[PDB]
């Protein structure tokens, strides 16, 4: 029941792997680089806001989420955007070829993303390599994604409703794993999957550091949506 909804949410919020536009894909480094930085910082901001709208649409397809106070929805979405963005990008990209595929089908090489993202893009590619080396199926990935957002957050109006949705999702992922791979559970696999979440939070704080650096540089000032994201995500 829940995993079907979660997988449909994922599928509906991801680009079909046949519409990948390799038009702005450039793999020659000598050409990969010489574009003034301004354009890359803007490209960075656009990728972030474009995936903000995509992922919010995904979040709205999570059974039970929409029944939560609108303020809780905004707190969960803003608190997890960076983690969602990093997880979804790392799951659909191709780390071995150094190819990044964003929430919209654009395929860029790592060396092109380094100009805008900073070293964080390398931390992202390493995360993609680690995540894919454990070959999570789509049902499991849709559950981890749901659990990355539907989790405890300070300043929540109704924390018990969220806690209930989280338990529902955790239990759904455990049932899928146990049924799929024999009546005998895989507690160790399960713990590695849930352990992928803290790594995601850190990748995120590393995204806040990249945004903070760009705000200080003041060359390509962060647009209103990124300014708000930065201030709203600040944990203190
Ligand atoms: C991305 C930004 C975060 C904000 C929080 O409140 C967390 O708990 C984790 C985060 N990583
Ligand atoms: K496809």
UniProtKB/Swiss-Prot annotation:
The chain holds residues 363 to 598 of 598 of the full protein. It is found in: Cytoplasm; Nucleus. Signal peptide: none annotated. This is Nuclear receptor subfamily 4 group A member 2. Interacts with SFPQ, NCOR2, SIN3A and HADC1. The interaction with NCOR2 increases in the absence of PITX3. Interacts with PER2. Transcriptional regulator which is important for the differentiation and maintenance of meso-diencephalic dopaminergic (mdDA) neurons during development. It is crucial for expression of a set of genes such as SLC6A3, SLC18A2, TH and DRD2 which are essential for development of mdDA neurons. A motif (nuclear export sequence (NES2)) lies at residues 206-215. Residues 1-233 form the NR LBD domain. It comes from the Eukaryota. The ligand-binding domain (LBD) contains no cavity as a result of the tight packing of side chains from several bulky hydrophobic residues in the region normally occupied by ligands. NR4A2 lacks a 'classical' binding site for coactivators. Expressed in a number of cell lines of T-cell, B-cell and fibroblast origin. Strong expression in brain tissue. A motif (nuclear export sequence (NES1)) lies at residues 81-90. Belongs to the nuclear hormone receptor family. NR4 subfamily. The gene is NR4A2.
